[PDB]
Design an enzyme around this catalytic site. Structure first.
Site, PDB file in Angstrom:
ATOM      1  N   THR I   1       0.822  -1.201   0.000  1.00  0.00           N
ATOM      2  CA  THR I   1       0.000   0.000   0.000  1.00  0.00           C
ATOM      3  C   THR I   1       0.858   1.252   0.000  1.00  0.00           C
ATOM      4  O   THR I   1       1.321   1.702   1.044  1.00  0.00           O
ATOM      5  CB  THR I   1      -0.936   0.036   1.207  1.00  0.00           C
ATOM      6  OG1 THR I   1      -1.695  -1.177   1.256  1.00  0.00           O
ATOM      7  CG2 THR I   1      -1.885   1.214   1.109  1.00  0.00           C
ATOM      8  N   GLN I   2       1.066   1.814  -1.191  1.00  0.00           N
ATOM      9  CA  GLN I   2       1.863   3.030  -1.298  1.00  0.00           C
ATOM     10  C   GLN I   2       1.105   4.242  -0.786  1.00  0.00           C
ATOM     11  O   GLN I   2       1.709   5.155  -0.214  1.00  0.00           O
ATOM     12  CB  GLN I   2       2.300   3.240  -2.746  1.00  0.00           C
ATOM     13  CG  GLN I   2       3.448   2.346  -3.149  1.00  0.00           C
ATOM     14  CD  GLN I   2       4.710   2.665  -2.381  1.00  0.00           C
ATOM     15  OE1 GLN I   2       5.324   1.784  -1.787  1.00  0.00           O
ATOM     16  NE2 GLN I   2       5.104   3.932  -2.388  1.00  0.00           N
TER      17      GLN I   2
END
Ligand SMILES: [K+]
Lengths: 236, 241, 248, 237, 196, 242, 213, 201, 216
Positions: I1-2
């Site tokens: 999850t950037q």
């Protein structure tokens, strides 16, 4: 042509047997005797180190596996070392991921799966080594026996190797006492069982016996030539 | 289906009814065809000796090296198929230098012998990668050197069993040389006595007459490094016999 | 599975490769192909074994395969393995052309294909290529060349050679009749017709049963031309006249 | 990929595939090599004397490098493969180590390659035995052989192929400090060694010579004939 | 920036190169040789980004020497130039491109003298004369002014000295010594260095 | 019947029999019998786990595995292959829950593991599993399910099944039951009865009964039978055996 | 965006002696202008003759410590002996350089007895270069600890003063003093000071309190 | 950081400071910047300290392997080429290695300069570092191939001293080494505090 | 999850005599929007440990799935040994560190609370693998708002009763609702004891607004 049921691990005998597995079991049976016990607080492995010649130091047979577990090998020593390295790696991985010692039973289950994998593939061979695994975890002292058939047993005492049946008979007749024994007389019982294997012309010496003990508040420690004497004194 | 020979009815990783890998036993038999090698571990050094087995006078003994240097503190005497010994010698050298690179300390002789011995049964068929070996190494090695524990001598056979030996003889004349070493070994014998005894045994077992060009002798002392004796240095001990 | 393995890439107890030898017997039963190196050219003459008159023969040739601008080859043995080998030869020649921007020397192409055959007789368990080829070419290094290849990956530079059915007799005749460094294109063609006469004993050597191609140099360009039916007929008729004249 | 174990230990500890490769070597053409004071000489027997052949294309003495050259007995194609890898390794070592390869280094490389084929899955051993000759950088002549098993030794003079034992015995009886005093004496020694096994003199001898700081030289048939004539006069007396 | 120059005469190829190897505002070496003898009659004058030049030159040298040993006959200067171009162009779109500017001088018995020019993109071009580096801008005008196809080798050396004097007079970088080599039918000949 | 066509599972006999699979079945019929009976509110398993040596601990070499929170597994034959298949079934159930987000139906777990074991009945590079096993589950919305998988890889639902040496006798005595109308508390008692009947005390000296049910009594969780219920079941079985 | 590293504060210090080694570290664990826990000691025990201090990103500190423990176990199993201080230092250099292109944000100081019973302090950078030192201070307050240790232990810039050999009693006092001064000027150090003394008997462990805010 | 190496009639002199900085902070004043690769071949640490140390240790490992395999000691040119190839495998990845590999081989004294950028040049006078220019100055004003051993020692010491005097990132002790035909010798570890008194009269 | 999509806010936890208590509101916010208003952010990992997670609720759901399956397998083994809260904390730290090292962080900051062997365990772990144990833990804005009160209570009184700890958690969550833009009134309280894990909710905290009339 040839017996056509003995060469391959993936060929079933018309009797429903795999002869390569039995031959690996024979490999275990040809190794030198190992015997292990366990009280309610300790698990002791004592092995009969065999010498190639009178000038050669005897083979190491108890091997460290983890902070809290150890093994006694009987069979092909290279297979023993490979399986020991696998056990050590699994224990270190459990300590890395969970920061807890790996339970002995789960380690033996991993050994069983890993040794069963070559039992079913072409070209592969069974691990021709039998391991007496003694460890201590939350569920008290444990002793295990692993066969080349990838079948492992939860034992109260066991002997594997050459002339193991005499040691097994001694262990069976004296099972009832092992639980309440202390460490000294537990390892004395183990030494008596191991002596039952030896022929009439030899007896236990500090050279040809090694002792590995793991317990409630005891690091797994292999006791070697000089350190075996306090356990040896008082047998016969 | 005809013309198939029983040379390949069995796989490489097949057990005998007595529980012994056929290939390991055949490699052990191959050991009994190699040149005799002798090693003695005294408290002030480890000596290793091996016959050159010069087939013809045109062959230079200096090329036929049956004793090598793993590092300054480890040696190796090889018997059997010397062609197969070179892979193990290279692996031992690589392991010693890797240990020095990683830990800044000399690698224990027992650890080197263990590292090389793990290769012994790492052979197989399609189950492994293309680079896998197909057959056991037909070499028995006598690792000898000095470390933190003092002078050490080890013996590794194709089965992968490595064992510490006070005095071990390997090769064609293993049995007679071993009996003689039994007769001669004492736990408190000096390195000069060890060298003389080893050369005496070699003379007893060699078909050729013992001389300065048909044997190789090396010592690993707790002081100086691995040392290969030469002419003007091997006559000085051959003459005494 | 070791039970079903044919063990193609192994040694015999006497130290010979049975698979290569069997492929060589297969080639020895195949169509006769001979080449003669002349001072001003090099030619390939090949017996056609499929003579049945329902064949069409659409292509440039049935035995002679053009390998690049300056080279050609013939085949004795299995036709499909011949096709894969000739495709590989074309690939190798064009790979040199791409890498160096000049035509490949003949011996290099022969060496590359022979290395592939060696690979097939060294590892992998696959059966060897039962094809012996007969190369003709030209390069700025050694001029006109003729090369033989074997299933084992062996090759040799020949000035006159024959591969296929009745190869030994053709080689003996070539040894008797080849004139060193003094054989022109027409002399080589006559010798080829004469050799094919005593090689195709059963077939009586009609012009419909042989395929002849010559490699000569014209104005700095190599020309590989399959001999027409008319001029092969003329060669055969001239040989017949010479044979009749021998009776005189 | 094919992964069968072609070379496996037989009972009594023999590797049959290696012995069969050695048998194939025994059927190859005789090759002799002699190490002199300032010249190293290699000689090969030509059973393929057939006159419709280009002598250039069946040479059995190949220059591995400017200072190393070899002659082989056994399968020709395996020899070509080993020679090509040896040349590649020579050039790679010259790039990486800046200096020309010593004879023993390329001998070790060839022996290691043969041994690897002796022990790796799915390939037969090289059915060639070699005679790797040449000069070191310090001007010391060298002579090695590499048998199919992968063992390499240094020899003052040796023979491989058919009649190796006969030529080896001849060299044992005829290799002295005087027999290699000059270049011509070494040439004549190698020719005399071949004449012990070749059917007819001169026409069945291929003889290459290497001397200090000079590349390999293929002695033309006229030089071989004049040398053979010199041995004829020497034998008359 | 480094300097190369080549002059193709009727029967020779005269090549010169600076000998300065600087990796800062300071010159680390003053006798650097940027000419690589690929064969007895081929020279590869390599300049460009550091590390790439020596690796690429030694790669092509290894391959040319391997061709000589494997075949018994040397690669022609045209063939070596095309091999060099093929390798550089293949590595152009690779993960590890070579940033090198090249001059390949050579002699062939049939093709005669040959001079080849290669930029870092691997664009090959046979030229009567060529140059690399920022000194090419100053010297190629003189080459155009004074070069004739039938120039002798002594007049070629004089023209090259004119170019080097122009570099010394109107070029900021200090390049005091230049190597000079000529490839004739006899091979590669080392001429005296032009210094100042 | 064989000796030429029984070397690999990748070979058909002249009469279309894969002899290697039949030899695996021969292996599994030489093992102690494990029975399972399906009732209204679950399935109860039972094993005549022989104790080869008395040196073993009570509970060594269990033959009643637990492959998911609601699925049990009784095994017969080679125990190494039984454990391997138990891990395969565990992995299949885990993957099913990870992907589709709910518990695997036993009708699907049986099919998946049966196809896994069938994949080993086709190739010469592998050998058929020497273990036939049973799977049992109970969910309120799907009811009690009992399936058997043999080395061939055939899956069938059973109202009661037996695997091992005494398959025939155990099935003969199970048929006498009316399991369709009974509950788990009685089926465990009858399973002990059947195991003690089919056991022979003269050839195989000693054995310990290993029981486990999954059902409405346990909310779908497959659990080893409580110690007191096992004692009562053994007491009934011994009294009935008279 | 995502930044794998956060500076979690913490200062470590090691002084070597004739027969002892002192490794000290604060227990403060910080993140930005916040305090995570006041009892996070940063000196880890490897063997009976080696203690390692880790400062920097806490995740890499934990991972590196666990990797080091696993590697000591591996070395003991493979060579049947414990790993000496120099060997641990070399192994840590190799481990740090294993991730040269994603470096551990950990400043490492290894203090312990060498094979001759003397003190040994090995310093480290994130990428692995190490050297043996008489004393080193790492972490946020390194620039404040180091000069005073130079003046006292190293006796630099001091004339006519006899170079008395360092004792445990004076070294402990100096460590306590430098840390009390460090807390008064560095925001990341404080809340406790754990001192580990490596002596022939074993590893002792003290804790002196220093200001919280 | 200043290091220098120059060849003369009696070997090659290697001299280096002992200062390592992290910004404007002096991390250490006792850095051993002459890497003793093996008893017959020296190295230099200039640039990234860990990079030089690790890659020259790998160079030592490979050289020792070479000596074992070939029974002859590795040449300075071969070791420098090994280092250059190893570093060039990592071009553009951020290595900051700049080294002077010194030794005596069969080709007389040997000095090579190897950097992460890819250079590999031999020479008679080299100095790599931040204070390298101040070392070139006096080193070139004092150099002669016919120098005595003591004069070469003093030249190297004075060159490193002046480089420390000007360059802010260079300082500490002036470690000096001398590679001769039978190995190298550590001759001095002089501190610039004492050298300032020696050179100021 | 950037980058996170739907985030949970502060999660609390304080040790007491007999276990720990963790509280987290039932809101998943998409930035400023309060999208999902009744999502539970507390997991019962097993009978002895629990897990409240701030940050991305999708990553929390994935990690909940993985932990639940791991506990299921553990129970399947049935060999007495069970995952301690310490083991869960260590595994979680290793997972989050492995995910940061692959530059794919699990955008959660997690509070593990447990009670095994008569010892209360409160553990911290963030997306970067930073882990530690404290008597009281607060995540996100709770660290700035709630944690000061927790520390000022636990420094004077090191050990708290169940009722005192619950009252302190309720006060802290009231403060968070006052002064956190991403807070929600509804929340759950989970406690571990010898009895196990019990989750109480949806609890609502009473609020006082008498200063509204003061402001003018
Ligand atoms: K502070």
């Amino acid at each position: 042509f040839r017996n056509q049921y003995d060469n391959d691990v993936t060929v079933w005998s018309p009797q429903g047997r795999i002869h390569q597995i039995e031959y690996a079991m024979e490999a275990v049976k040809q190794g030198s005797a190992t015997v292990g016990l366990k009280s309610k607080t300790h698990a002791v492995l004592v092995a009969l180190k065999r010498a190639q010649s009178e000038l050669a130091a005897h083979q190491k047979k108890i091997l460290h596996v983890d902070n809290h577990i150890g093994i006694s090998i009987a069979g092909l020593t290279a297979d023993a070392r490979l399986l020991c390295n696998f056990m050590r790696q699994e224990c270190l991985d459990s300590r890395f991921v969970f920061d807890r010692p790996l339970p002995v039973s789960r380690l033996v289950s991993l050994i069983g799966s890993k040794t069963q994998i070559p039992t079913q593939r072409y070209g592969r061979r069974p691990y021709g080594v039998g391991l007496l695994i003694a460890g201590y975890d939350d569920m008290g002292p444990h002793i295990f026996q692993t066969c080349p058939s990838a079948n492992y047993f939860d034992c109260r005492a066991m002997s594997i190797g050459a002339r193991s049946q005499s040691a097994r008979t001694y262990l069976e007749r004296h099972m009832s006492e092992f639980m309440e024994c202390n460490l000294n007389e537990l390892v004395k019982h183990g030494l008596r069982a191991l002596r039952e294997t030896l022929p009439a012309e030899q007896d236990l010496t500090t050279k040809n016996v090694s002792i590995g003990i793991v317990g409630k508040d005891l690091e797994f420690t292999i006791y070697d030539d000089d350190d075996v004497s306090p356990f040896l004194e008082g047998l016969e | 289906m005809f013309l198939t020979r029983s040379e390949y009815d069995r796989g490489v990783n097949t057990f005998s009814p007595e529980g012994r890998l056929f290939q390991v036993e055949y490699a052990i038999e191959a050991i009994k065809l190699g040149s005799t090698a002798i090693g003695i571990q005294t408290s002030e050094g480890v000596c290793l000796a091996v016959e050159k087995r010069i087939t013809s006078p045109l062959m230079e003994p200096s090329s036929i090296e049956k004793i090598v240097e793993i590092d300054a503190h480890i040696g190796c005497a090889m018997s059997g198929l010397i062609a197969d010994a070179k892979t193990l010698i290279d692996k031992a050298r690589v392991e010693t230098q890797n240990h020095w690179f990683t830990y800044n300390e000399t690698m224990t002789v027992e650890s080197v012998t263990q590292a090389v011995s793990n290769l012994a049964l790492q052979f197989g068929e399609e189950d492994a990668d293309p680079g896998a070996m197909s057959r056991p190494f037909g070499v028995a090695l006598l690792f000898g050197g000095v470390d933190e524990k003092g002078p050490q001598l080890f013996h590794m056979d194709p089965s992968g069993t490595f064992v510490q030996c006070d005095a071990r003889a390997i090769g064609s004349a293993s049995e007679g040389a071993q009996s003689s070493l039994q007769e001669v070994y004492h736990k408190s014998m000096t390195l000069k006595e060890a060298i003389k005894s080893s050369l005496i045994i070699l003379k007893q077992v060699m078909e050729e007459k013992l001389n300065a060009t048909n044997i190789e002798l090396a010592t690993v002392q707790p002081g100086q490094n691995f040392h290969m004796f030469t002419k003007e240095e091997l006559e000085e001990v051959i003459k005494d016999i | 599975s070791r039970r079903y393995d044919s063990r193609t890439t192994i040694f015999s107890p006497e130290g010979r490769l049975y698979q290569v030898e069997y492929a060589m017997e297969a080639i020895g039963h195949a169509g006769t192909c001979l080449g003669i190196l002349a001072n001003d050219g090099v030619l390939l003459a090949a017996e056609r074994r499929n003579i049945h008159k329902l064949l069409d023969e659409v292509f440039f040739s049935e035995k002679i395969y053009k390998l690049n601008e300056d080279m050609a080859c013939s085949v004795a043995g299995i036709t499909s393995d011949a096709n894969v080998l000739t495709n590989e030869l074309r690939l190798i020649a064009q790979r040199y052309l791409l890498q160096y921007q000049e035509p490949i020397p003949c011996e290099q192409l022969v060496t590359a294909l022979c290395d592939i055959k060696q690979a097939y007789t060294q590892f992998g368990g696959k059966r060897p290529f039962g094809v012996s080829l007969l190369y003709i070419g030209w390069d700025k290094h050694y001029g006109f060349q003729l090369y033989q290849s074997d299933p084992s990956g062996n090759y040799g530079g020949w000035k006159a050679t024959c591969i296929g059915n009745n190869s030994a007799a053709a080689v003996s005749m070539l040894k008797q009749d080849y004139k060193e460094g003094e054989m022109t294109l027409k002399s080589a063609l006559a010798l080829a017709i004469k050799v094919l006469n005593k090689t195709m004993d059963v077939s009586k050597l009609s012009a419909e049963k042989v395929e002849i191609a010559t490699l000569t140099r014209e104005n700095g360009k190599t020309v590989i031309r399959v001999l027409k039916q008319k001029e092969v007929e003329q060669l055969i008729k001239k040989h017949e006249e010479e044979e009749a004249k021998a009776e005189r | 990929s094919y992964d069968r174990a072609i070379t496996v230990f037989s009972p009594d500890g023999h590797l049959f595939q290696v012995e069969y490769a050695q048998e194939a070597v025994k059927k190859g053409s005789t090759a002799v090599g002699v190490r002199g004071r300032d010249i190293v000489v290699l000689g090969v027997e030509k059973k393929s004397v057939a006159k419709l052949q280009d002598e250039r294309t069946v040479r059995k003495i190949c220059a591995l490098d400017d200072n190393v050259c070899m002659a082989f007995a056994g399968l020709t194609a395996d020899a070509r493969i080993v020679i090509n890898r040896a040349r590649v390794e020579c050039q790679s070592h010259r790039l990486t180590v800046e200096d020309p390869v010593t004879v023993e280094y390329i001998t070790r490389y060839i022996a290691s390659l043969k041994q690897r084929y002796t022990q790796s899955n799915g390939r037969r051993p090289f059915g060639i035995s070699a005679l790797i000759v040449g000069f070191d950088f310090d001007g010391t002549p060298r002579l090695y052989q590499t048998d199919p098993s992968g063992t390499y030794h240094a020899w003052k003079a040796n023979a491989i192929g058919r009649g190796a034992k006969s030529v080896r015995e001849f060299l044992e009886k005829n290799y002295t400090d005087e027999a290699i005093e000059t270049d011509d004496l070494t040439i004549k020694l190698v020719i005399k060694a071949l004449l012990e096994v070749v059917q007819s003199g001169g026409k069945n001898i291929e003889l290459a010579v290497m001397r200090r700081d000079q590349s390999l030289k293929i002695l033309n048939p006229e030089e071989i004939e004049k040398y053979v004539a010199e041995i004829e006069k020497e034998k008359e007396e | 920036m480094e300097y190369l120059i080549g002059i193709q005469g009727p029967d020779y190829v005269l090549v010169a190169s600076d000998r300065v190897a600087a990796s800062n505002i300071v010159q680390m070496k003053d006798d650097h040789d940027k000419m690589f003898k690929m064969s007895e009659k081929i020279l590869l004058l390599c300049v460009g980004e550091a590390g790439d030049t020596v690796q690429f030159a030694e790669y092509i040298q290894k391959n040319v020497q391997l061709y000589k040993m494997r075949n018994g006959y040397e690669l022609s200067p045209t063939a070596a130039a095309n091999f060099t171009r093929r390798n550089l162009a293949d590595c152009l779109r690779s993960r590890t491109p070579y940033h090198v500017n090249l001059l390949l001088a050579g002699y062939d018995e049939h093709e005669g003298p040959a001079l080849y020019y290669m930029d870092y993109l691997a664009a090959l071009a046979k030229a009567p004369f060529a140059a690399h580096g920022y000194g090419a801008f100053l010297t190629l005008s003189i080459l155009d002014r004074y070069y004739t196809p039938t120039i002798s080798r002594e007049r070629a050396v004089e023209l090259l000295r004119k170019c080097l004097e122009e570099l010394q007079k109107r070029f900021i970088l200090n390049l005091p010594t230049f190597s000079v080599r000529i490839i004739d039918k006899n091979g590669i000949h080392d001429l005296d260095n032009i210094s100042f | 019947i064989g000796t030429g066509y029984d070397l690999s599972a990748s070979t058909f006999s002249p009469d279309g029999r894969v002899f290697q699979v039949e030899y695996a079945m021969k292996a599994v019929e030489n093992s102690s019998t494990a029975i399972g009976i399906r009732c209204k509110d679950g399935v109860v398993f039972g094993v005549e786990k022989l104790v080869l040596s008395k040196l073993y601990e009570e509970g060594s070499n269990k033959r009643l595995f637990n492959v998911d929170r609601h699925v049990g597994m009784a095994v017969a034959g080679l125990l190494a292959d039984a454990r391997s298949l138990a891990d395969i079934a565990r992995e299949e159930a885990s993957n099913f829950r990870s992907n589709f987000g709910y518990n695997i139906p036993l009708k699907h777990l049986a099919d998946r593991v049966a196809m896994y074991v069938h994949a080993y009945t086709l190739y010469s590079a592998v050998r058929p599993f020497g273990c036939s096993f049973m799977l049992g589950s109970y969910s309120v919305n799907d009811g009690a399910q009992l399936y058997m998988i043999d080395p061939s890889g055939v899956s069938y639902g059973y109202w009661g099944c037996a695997i091992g040496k005494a398959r025939q006798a155990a099935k003969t005595e199970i048929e006498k039951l009316q399991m369709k109308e009974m509950t788990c508390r009685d089926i465990v008692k009858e399973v002990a009865k059947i195991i003690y009947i089919v056991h022979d005390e003269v050839k195989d000296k000693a054995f310990e009964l290993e029981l486990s049910w999954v059902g409405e009594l346990t909310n779908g969780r497959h659990e080893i039978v409580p110690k007191d219920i096992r004692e009562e079941a053994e007491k009934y079985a011994k009294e009935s055996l008279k | 965006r995502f930044s794998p590293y956060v500076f979690n504060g913490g200062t470590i210090l090691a002084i070597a002696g004739e027969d002892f080694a002192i490794v000290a570290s604060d227990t403060r664990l910080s993140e930005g202008f916040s305090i995570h826990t006041r009892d996070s000691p940063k000196c880890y025990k490897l063997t009976d003759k080696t203690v390692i201090g880790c400062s920097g990103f806490h995740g890499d500190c934990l991972t590196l410590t666990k990797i080091i423990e696993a590697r000591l176990k591996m070395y003991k199993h493979s060579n049947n002996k414990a790993m000496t201080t120099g060997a641990i230092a070399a192994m840590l250099s190799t481990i740090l350089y294993s991730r040269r292109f994603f470096p551990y944000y950990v400043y490492n100081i290894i203090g312990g007895l060498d094979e001759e019973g003397k003190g040994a302090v090995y310093s480290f950078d994130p990428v692995g270069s190490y050297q043996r030192d008489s004393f080193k201070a790492g972490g946020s307050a390194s620039a404040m600890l180091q000069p005073l240790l130079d003046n006292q232990v190293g006796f630099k810039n001091m004339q006519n003063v006899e170079h008395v050999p360092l004792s445990l009693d004076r070294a402990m006092r100096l460590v306590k003093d430098v840390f009390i001064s460090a807390a008064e000027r560095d925001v990341y150090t404080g809340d406790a000071l754990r001192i580990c003394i490596v002596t022939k008997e074993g590893i002792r462990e003290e804790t002196v309190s220093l200001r919280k805010d | 950081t200043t290091t220098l190496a120059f060849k003369f009639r009696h070997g090659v002199i290697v001299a280096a400071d002992s200062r390592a900085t992290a910004g404007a902070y002096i991390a250490s004043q006792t850095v051993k910047k002459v890497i003793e690769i093996n008893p017959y071949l020296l190295g230099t640490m200039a640039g990234g300290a860990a990079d030089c140390s690790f890659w020259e240790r790998l160079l030592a490992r490979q050289c020792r392997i070479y000596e074992l395999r070939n029974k002859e000691r590795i040449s300075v040119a071969a070791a420098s080429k090994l280092l250059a190839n190893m570093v060039y495998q990592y071009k553009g990845m951020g290595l900051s290695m700049g080294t002077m590999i010194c030794g005596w081989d069969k080709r007389g004294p040997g000095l090579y300069y190897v950097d992460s950028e890819g250079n590999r040049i031999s020479g008679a006078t080299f100095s790599v570092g931040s204070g390298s220019v101040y070392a070139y100055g006096v080193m070139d004003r004092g150099y002669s191939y016919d120098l005595e051993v003591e004069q070469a020692y003093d030249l190297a010491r004075r060159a490193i001293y002046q480089a420390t005097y000007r360059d802010a990132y260079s300082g500490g002790a002036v470690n000096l080494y001398h590679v001769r035909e039978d190995g190298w010798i550590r001759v001095s570890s002089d501190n610039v505090a004492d050298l300032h008194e020696k050179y100021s009269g | 999850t950037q980058n996170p999509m739907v985030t949970g806010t502060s999660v609390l936890g304080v040790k007491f005599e007999g276990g720990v208590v963790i509280a987290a509101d039932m809101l998943g916010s998409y930035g400023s929007l309060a999208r999902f208003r009744n999502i539970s952010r507390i997991m019962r990992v097993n009978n002895s440990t629990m897990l409240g997670a701030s940050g991305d609720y999708a990553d929390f759901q994935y990690l909940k799935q993985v932990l639940g399956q791991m506990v299921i397998d553990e129970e399947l083994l049935g060999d007495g040994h069970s995952y301690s809260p310490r083991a869960i904390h260590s595994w979680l730290t290793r997972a989050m560190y492995s995910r940061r090292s692959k530059m794919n962080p699990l955008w959660n900051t997690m509070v593990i609370g447990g009670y095994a062997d008569g010892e209360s365990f409160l553990g911290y772990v963030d997306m970067l693998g930073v882990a530690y144990e404290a008597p009281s833990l607060a995540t996100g804005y709770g660290a700035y708002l709630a944690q000061p009160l927790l520390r000022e209570v636990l420094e004077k009184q090191p050990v708290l009763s169940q009722t005192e700890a619950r009252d302190l958690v309720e006060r802290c969550m009231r403060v968070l609702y006052y002064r956190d833009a991403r807070s929600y009134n509804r929340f759950q309280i989970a406690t571990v004891t010898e009895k196990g894990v019990e989750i109480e909710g949806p609890l609502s905290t009473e609020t006082n607004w008498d200063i509204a009339h003061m402001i003018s």
